[PDB]
Amino acid sequence: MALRKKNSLLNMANSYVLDSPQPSNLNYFWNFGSLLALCLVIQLATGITLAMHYT
Amino acid sequence: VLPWSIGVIIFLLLIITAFMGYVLVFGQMSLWGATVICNLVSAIPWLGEDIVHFLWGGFSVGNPTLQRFFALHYLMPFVLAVFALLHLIALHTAGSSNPLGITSNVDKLSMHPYYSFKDLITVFAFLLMFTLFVFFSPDKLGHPDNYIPANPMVTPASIVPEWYLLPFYAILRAIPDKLGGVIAMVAAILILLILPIVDRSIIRGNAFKPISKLLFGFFICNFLLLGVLGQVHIEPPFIVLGQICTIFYFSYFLILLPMVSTIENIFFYIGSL
Amino acid sequence: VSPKTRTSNLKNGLTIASESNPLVQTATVGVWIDAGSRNENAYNNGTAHFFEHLAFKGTDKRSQHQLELDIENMGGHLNAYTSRESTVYYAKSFKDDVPKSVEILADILQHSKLAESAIDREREVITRELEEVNKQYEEVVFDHLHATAFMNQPLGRTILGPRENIQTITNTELRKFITENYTADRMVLVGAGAVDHDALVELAEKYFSHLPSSQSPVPLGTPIPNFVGSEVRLRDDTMPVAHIAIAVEGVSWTSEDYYTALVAQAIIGNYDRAVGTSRHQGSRLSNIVSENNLANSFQSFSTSYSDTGLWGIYLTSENTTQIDDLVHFTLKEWNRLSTSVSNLQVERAKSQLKAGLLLSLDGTTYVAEDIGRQLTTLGRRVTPAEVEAKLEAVTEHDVRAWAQKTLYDKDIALVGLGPIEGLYDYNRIRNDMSMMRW
Amino acid sequence: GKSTYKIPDFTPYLKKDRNTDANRLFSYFMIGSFGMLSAAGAKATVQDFLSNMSASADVLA
Amino acid sequence: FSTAEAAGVKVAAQDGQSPISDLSVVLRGGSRYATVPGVSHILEKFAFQNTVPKSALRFVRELELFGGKLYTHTTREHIVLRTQFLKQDLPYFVDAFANVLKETKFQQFELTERVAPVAELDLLKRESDPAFTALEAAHEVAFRTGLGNSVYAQGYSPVTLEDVKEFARQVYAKQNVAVVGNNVVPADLQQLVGTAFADLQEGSKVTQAGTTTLHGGEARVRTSTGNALTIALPIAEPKPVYHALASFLGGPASMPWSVGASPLAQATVGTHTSVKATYHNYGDAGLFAITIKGDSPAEISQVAHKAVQALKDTGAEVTEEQAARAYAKSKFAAAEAFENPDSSASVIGMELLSGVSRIAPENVQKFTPAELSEAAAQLSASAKPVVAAVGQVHALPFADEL
Amino acid sequence: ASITSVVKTSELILKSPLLSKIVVPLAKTYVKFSGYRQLGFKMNDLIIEETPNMQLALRRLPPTESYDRVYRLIRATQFSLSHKLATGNDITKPEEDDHYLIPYILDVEAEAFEKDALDNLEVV
Amino acid sequence: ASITSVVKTSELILKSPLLSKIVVPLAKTYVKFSGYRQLGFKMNDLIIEETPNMQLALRRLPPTESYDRVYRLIRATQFSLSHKLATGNDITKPEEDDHYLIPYILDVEAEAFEKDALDNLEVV
Ligand code: HEM
Ligand code: HEM
Ligand SMILES: CCCCCCCCCCCCO[C@@H]1O[C@H](CO)[C@@H](O[C@H]2O[C@H](CO)[C@@H](O)[C@H](O)[C@H]2O)[C@H](O)[C@H]1O
Ligand SMILES: CCCCCCCCCCCCO[C@@H]1O[C@H](CO)[C@@H](O[C@H]2O[C@H](CO)[C@@H](O)[C@H](O)[C@H]2O)[C@H](O)[C@H]1O
């Protein structure tokens, strides 16, 4: 068995981002979920950095 | 091994979290502790000084450093909670170990209600200790100098970390070299990662190992002595004592535990023939 | 040390090749032809296989029934097979029944009736064969493998041919096929076992002397294939066993890398859970597969043709949730032929092959098949001393260099049959043809 | 429509030079360029962004 | 094959001109001698397991370095263990057989994890063919015990490690062992067997518990995986004419895409069925069988009637042509059997372990039409016909219908 | 450490007269102070089992030995949670402290180590 | 909404001459504009199946109907991801748009609803 399946931590990531079985016909409107994840990552990085300078 | 190795990182994150939080008061110990601990980074070769100025956001500990420590002190507990969750998910593949060191697959109990109700006892014991300090002696564990506002000009009589960092400070003092001392101090925590290798026992745990139990007792008391030596003055005879205790600390991992665990394997085999 | 293979020619250009064994009492004589389905076009695809049926349906002298009786009276049997590049017709008999068998073979090849009544009768028999190969899963998998790897090219066609052609094959096109292809310079008369070479040459002069020669005689085993990386999925949830083949373009008979490809094939090797020794084999893939119950079997192959080949593996598995692991571990073992193999694996595989190439030939039919195959693909029988020297010349550097240009990061042809839901899409399979860590 | 050995028509898509090193090298040039700009973009992003932590203009003054 | 004796062990070898040698140990340990059902199959599968000098793992890894191969099978009469290797590697193979016979550690985990599962897959693969099942069922009806014991291990009656260890204590002994070397220099083999098998127990000849008794009857193995029917006739006096009769009646075609000119082959016309007559000599009794497989129970039934008719018709009159065809087909069958290493080893094994001299293919007797018809007549007029039906047994014939 | 290692080193000591004279009495005292017999365990019950090799050895135990081991583990767990010690027949006597598992694990490890060696063979 | 409901209401409309005269032509245009036939679907292929009742009805389909449904779903998915429409024989003609599933789901639901009623019976 491949490590990505055998190790429980790796397997959680594997189940969501790699082997996760998707429909083969998602259109571009299924891309907003990953855009929202990107916005959340940008807001965390910029927000924590602003907090280092904001009073 | 995996929950233990993630656990060692949890412990490093707790140290960083607590250190940054202590600076936020901006009393004398806050400032001078930040100064001396952050200057250890200057030991990193070539780029060390540059890294320190980058951490401080200036040429000494000041407003930029305090505002960044606030933002990081707020964040780091969330990172710590994630790693705490990770070490439990990693543990869930084997389950909890137990004091006998044997499998418990033969005899399991549900977490609830048994361990829920057993946890309440220690929760209330903890809350009693909490109450005695918070309401009756709130400053017993602190340093009075932290009630003096930070003053970059006056240096306090003795600059020590909070008590829980003291053993690592004694280990750092033991090595005369600056970089040497920093490495030793970090190694004192990272060496926990080799316990899975240096323990050569065929048996899990110390319940049935009289010599291992004695060695463990000495290791723990030595760790407390290192703590005490972390806050004494750099004077005779504590300088040499700190070095001997530091050697004992490391030799537990590198020499004694591998030797003792090897011999006990042989004694269990021969002794039970 | 085996007896020397004697070789003679006739005037038309028919080769006679023989290897006597004074310890046996039977003999295999037959005719190996350098011709097969690949010589057909798209319109007469199926002809060569159609002829094989009619060859036993009666000649100008002996009728179908007389033919049956004549062979029954000989005591042995006749056998035939048509492949993509080779056709064989042979007769196993007693020592002293060899002149009868040569005479019958000469008759069915030169003087077959191909009577419209018999064409029409077999046209149904062959039509029924189209719906019953379906059961021979290994054959289904390999025929789809050729069809896709050599997409729209002659090597990609099946031997049976399409249903449409079976209904339209005439005696004219049958006759045309065997007149164009069954020529003396493409044929070898082979004898193995209790045969005298000089006796066999006389029988060849008696029966195969009036064979046509081709206008332009090329040497035996003379041929452009353009491999297509591609996949065929034949999912069938009701089957319990998945059958999967994966192949890359391999080597021809006369490649300089022919032995290097055989050694590489032996490093992966075969496995079968039903054989007792298979759990103890040295192959890394064998160990992975057996320890984790990933497969019932796997069989590495290196199939050669005149101008191309296919090199790969055929897997069978009931472990339908771990097909991904099976394919993953197999292709990571192939990666190691490029990245990791050393003298350890190479010298072990060479040892195993030095014996294996000799062990295979353990009866007169195997010997005849070896003489016939080698004469029709290489133009000569290669002595075991030459074979031992070519194997010894294979180094670990040769294997690594071969795998780096043949396997590493290359397109595969992939066929899956059965419960193959767990077999990932083409990209994820083809991504295992390289290692990001290297 | 019925025989599964007759591969469907892929001629509208098949490249004639599909097995050549030139053919693979082109696709890896595209992947490589993409990886190159992503590396240069990440480096620029990280450098400009992290510089916020170096002494600000009022501190340097 | 020059028969000799080396340190109490019978050794037969024939030198040749090939790089490939076959060494076979033939053991008098087949199923007719089986103490408990299936033990001879289990013992066969326990060969080349862990010995005291060499583990199964080490043996397989070293065998791969020599490029050797290993073949084992169990019959009603013998266990045969064959190795195929290059001529020069003979000493290694002799020593390996010595380790197996002298020093096999019969360990419980090997039985549970290695030996028994492989024995079970072996049987399941054989039974995939309903004709195998039918012919096995027929021997069980005809002989009950001894020759009627199952050859293979079955799940309903489990073999224990103590069963296998006891049987091996009997079988692995100088009295039950013959060594047969194809393409082995006979003088060299005698020298090596003489040093390697010197400390093997002498033991005693393994014997069949009880005399061979013949019985008629019916077996109705209901399967869902194909249809077959055996019509067997137990023979109290095995005679070589039944070989000629089996080859005469025939059944398989001698030519691709054909039915064949044999009476039994001609019984299958218009049906997708096959047929095969076989004769099994077991020294003290014999079995003449005609097995018919097919997909249609109706067609099998149809052929079965024609098959018994064919036998009756043969008992009436054979032509001279047909008798000569029988001699030819029979000489050929004999020759190819003496060539095939599996059957070869057992043939000389029988000569060495019993005393039944081999009949060379060149010395196969020609039977007159009188002798053939007389043999078929005895079979058509048997008091004890056996019929084993496999598959849709409600639709297959019964003995009294035939 | 592997059981193989422990057993081989022990055998070196038991061979040397001097060494055995000084080590055997120590080992017996060690076992007495260890106190696992006071929870009704046999020494081999304590060996770490969460390993492929040990899981294979435990599967090869005869059913009787296996059922008895399960009972000793359950019984010791009940003494542990109650903070009691074994009394009477529950205490393991020195003559009952048999190495029931050692032969199985030594065979498992023998094959495992031979496989490692043979994976690294070099044709000469 | 349940298939039972939809079927019963539809039958009320089809009964009423007036209602059918005005609803049937509208329903036919609606189906034409819906455009599921241009992806080779039959109407019943579109019904939500992630419910216990529908899973049971699909399990009761005859094997051939079931294999054909799987092919239409795969084929329509391939048209969807390619942004193409069916052409030729892949387009569902009105005469091929049969209610293959409706009888199975109506039987599943009949029992489910009878069970609900009978769970609430009151002995009189
Ligand atoms: C979902 C995530 C978030 C959203 C939608 C969000 C939204 C906003 C918005 C709308 C503002 C006003 C910006 C302006 O006009 O100047 C702002 C300011 C701010 N945010 Fe966030 N934020 C998020 C996450 C964070 C995080 C994680 C932090 C960490 C502290 C943070 C720190 C700040 C700070 C310090 C300011 C004030 C300085 C400024 O205006 O730029 N934010 N945020
Ligand atoms: C925020 C800090 C931590 C939290 C909240 C936490 C919580 C827990 C909990 C709830 C368990 C299961 C119950 C128990 O055994 O007590 C556990 C087990 C464990 N933790 Fe932690 N932990 C933390 C830090 C650490 C650290 C620093 C280490 C190691 C250096 C560690 C190593 C482990 C290990 C090895 C176990 C498994 C112990 C066993 O059951 O045998 N944890 N932890
Ligand atoms: C999105 C960022 C990536 C980080 C992953 C997100 C963290 C959330 C993960 C924890 C939630 C548990 O997630 C759960 O994991 C198991 C295995 O990992 C998955 O289980 C799935 O995959 C595994 C194998 O890949 C199979 O054994 C299983 O049959 C299948 O359902 C669950 O479908 C998923 O719900
Ligand atoms: C693991 C990652 C490694 C550590 C990351 C390094 C952190 C900080 C490194 C350098 C950051 C400052 O480095 C400095 O960056 C700014 C851009 O940001 C550059 O400045 C350059 O561009 C900026 C705008 O883009 C202009 O205002 C400036 O006049 C010009 O010189 C300097 O030329 C460089 O010296």
Numbering used by the authors:
A (entry chain C): 1 to 55
B (entry chain N): 111 to 383
C (entry chain A): 26 to 248, 260 to 474
D (entry chain E): 39 to 99
E (entry chain B): 15 to 416
F (entry chain R), G (entry chain G): 2 to 125
Question: What sentences appear in the manuscript?
Answer:
The cytochrome bc 1 complex, also known as respiratory complex III (CIII), in the electron-transfer chain of the inner mitochondrial membrane is a homodimer (CIII2) of two biochemically identical protomers. CIII2 catalyses the transfer of electrons from the lipophilic two-electron donor ubiquinol (QH2) to the water-soluble, one-electron acceptor protein cytochrome c, contributing to an electrochemical proton gradient across the membrane. Electron transfer within the complex occurs through the prosthetic groups of the three catalytic core subunits: heme b L and heme b H of cytochrome b (cyt b), heme c 1 of cytochrome c 1 (cyt c 1) and the [2Fe–2S] cluster of the iron–sulfur protein (ISP), often called the Rieske protein after its discoverer. The Rieske domain is tethered to the complex by one transmembrane helix and a connecting flexible linker that acts as a hinge.
(iv) +FCN: oxidized with potassium ferricyanide. In intermediate positions, the tip of the Rieske domain is close to the ef-loop of cyt b. Map density for the Rieske domain was less good at positions in which the cluster-bearing tip did not interact closely with either cyt b or cyt c 1. In maps of fully reduced or oxidized samples this area of cyt b was well-resolved irrespective of the position of the Rieske domain. The addition of antimycin A reduced the resolution of these regions, whereas both the cd 1-helix and the ef-loop were well-resolved in the intermediate positions of CIII2 oxidized with ferricyanide or reduced with ascorbate or DQH2.
